[model samples]
Target: ESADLRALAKHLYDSYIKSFPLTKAKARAILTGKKSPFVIYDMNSLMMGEDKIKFKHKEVAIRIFQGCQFRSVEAVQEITEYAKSIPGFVNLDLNDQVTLLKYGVHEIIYTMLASLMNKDGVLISEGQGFMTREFLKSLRKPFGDFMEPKFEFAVKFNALELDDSDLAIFIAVIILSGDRPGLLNVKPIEDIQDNLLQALELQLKLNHPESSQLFAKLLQKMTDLRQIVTEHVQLLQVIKKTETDMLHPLLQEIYKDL
Candidate 1:
C-alpha cells in the first residue's frame, strides 16, 4: 500500500507521454488541416495578417466555423481509454464514472488543445490549416467567445512547455478530481487524484530545476482550467438561448451540462 508518488508519476508518463520528436511538428503530418470554402482563409496564407472578412459576419463561414465542432468519436474514445486506464477509474460506481467523464472531458480537451494552439492561432484540419486569432475572433458572437479564456490560458500553459508524458498525470489528475459534482464515493476518488498530484510533483523534483517551480505553476493552471470550464458552461447556456439549432446534436450532449 505504498503510495509511491515516484512510480506513480512514471507510470502516467509511460502510459501517455508525447513530448519528444516535436509534438506539433509531428502532429502536422497526421492532421488534414482545414480548407474553408471562403477566400477569407487560405490555410498558410491566412496566418500572414489580414482581418478582411469577419468570419462571424459571413453567413456560411459563421456556421461553418461555429458548427461542426471537435470531440468526435475518437476524442471520446481516447478519453474513455484514458478513463479506463487510470487507476481506480473503472472500480468506482457507474454514476461516478460517467459524471467524471462528462465534466472532465472538456477540461481534458481544453488542456490538450494547448498542444494544437499557439499565440497566433489554433491548428486545425489535421495540421494543414491554421486559423489566426483575428479570424477566430469573428466567431465570438455566441460561440467562439468561449475561446477567450481558452486562448489566455493556452498560451500561458504552452509556455510551461510540457510533454505528453507531463500531460498524462495532469489529465489523470483532472479526470479523478474529487470536487466534481454527482460523485457517488468521495474517499476513493481523492487517492488517485492526490497520488497523481504528488506524482506530478515528484516529476517536478525529479525533473525540472527547483528554480522553475514547475509544480506550483501547474497547480495554478489547473485552478485556471476549472474556472475556465465553469465559465465555458455559463457562456454556452446563453448561446443555447440565442443560437438555437446551430450546434450539432452531439455537441448538445456535451453542452447538456449547462
Candidate 2:
C-alpha cells in the first residue's frame, strides 16, 4: 500500500537527517539567500605552504581531496546503518544488498553533497570554511578539475531546492537501483527500485505541486551521477598511476574496487 511506502520514506529521512549538514531548517534564516561569510582556502594556504602555479607536490592536492574524502567516509558509515531501516530491504538476497551499497554509494555521496552547496561553492571542514569551484580548478591538472563537474552538478541540483524529505526518498531510490553491474539478484532489486521510484514521485508531487514536469527533470538529472562517477574514476586513475603516496585508507577502500 501507498501508506507503507510513505512510512518507509519517512523512516529514511528521519534516520539519515544527520547525513545532511544543511538541514532544511537551517535555510530558514540566511545562508540560502545571502551567502554567509565562509573563509575560502586555496590548496597552498590550506596546508600551510606557499602557493604555486599548479601544485608542485601531488601530496598537497591529495590532502585537500582527502578532506572531502574524510567527510565522505563518515557519510558512508551513516548510510550503512540507514540502508537496513528500509522496510523490505532486509528481505533481499544478502549478497545483492552488499552489491547495491558498494556500487551506489559514490552516487549517493555526490547527491548528498548538494545539501552543502550553493551557486558559488560548498562548505568544507565541517562548516568552518567553504571551497569555491574556481579555486579548486586552479590546482594541478589531475586533482584540479576533477571536482568541477560534481560542483556544477550540485549547483543545478541545489537549484531545485529539494527539501530534506524529498531528498530522502530520492536517495533510497538511487541505492536500490536495478541497473548496477555485478548484481546476481536482479529481479528483486528492480522490484524494490520501482517501488522506491513511485515513493519518490509521491514526495515530489506533494512538495512541488505546481510544476507538471518536475518529475521528468529530476529523473533526467540522476543520469548525470553515473557520468560523474565515470569521470571521477578516469581522473583518479590518472593520479593513481603516478605513484601517489596515499589518498586516505577510507577512500582507497572504495577507489580500489570502484
Q: Candidate 2 residues 1-258, lDDT tens each? A: 678778767877886675555564454233445445344566455554223222222366666765555566677777777777666678888888888898888888888777777666666654445576667777777777877888789878877768888878887888898887778888877887788888888878878998687778888888887889888877766767884565556656764443
Residue lDDT tens for model 1, 52-155: 43322124434443432532334565777767878778898889998889888878877877787766666554444456666666654664565667789998
Model 1 / residue 193 / CA error / Å: 1.7
lDDT for position 32 in model 1: 28
**Residue 182 error, candidate 1, Å:** 2.1
Q: Which ten residues in a row have the lowest lDDT in candidate 2?
A: 49-58
Runs in model 1 deviating more than 4 A are 1-6, 17-62, 65-68, 72-74, 244-258
What is the clash count for each candidate, in the order shown?
A: 9, 0
Top candidate (lDDT): 2
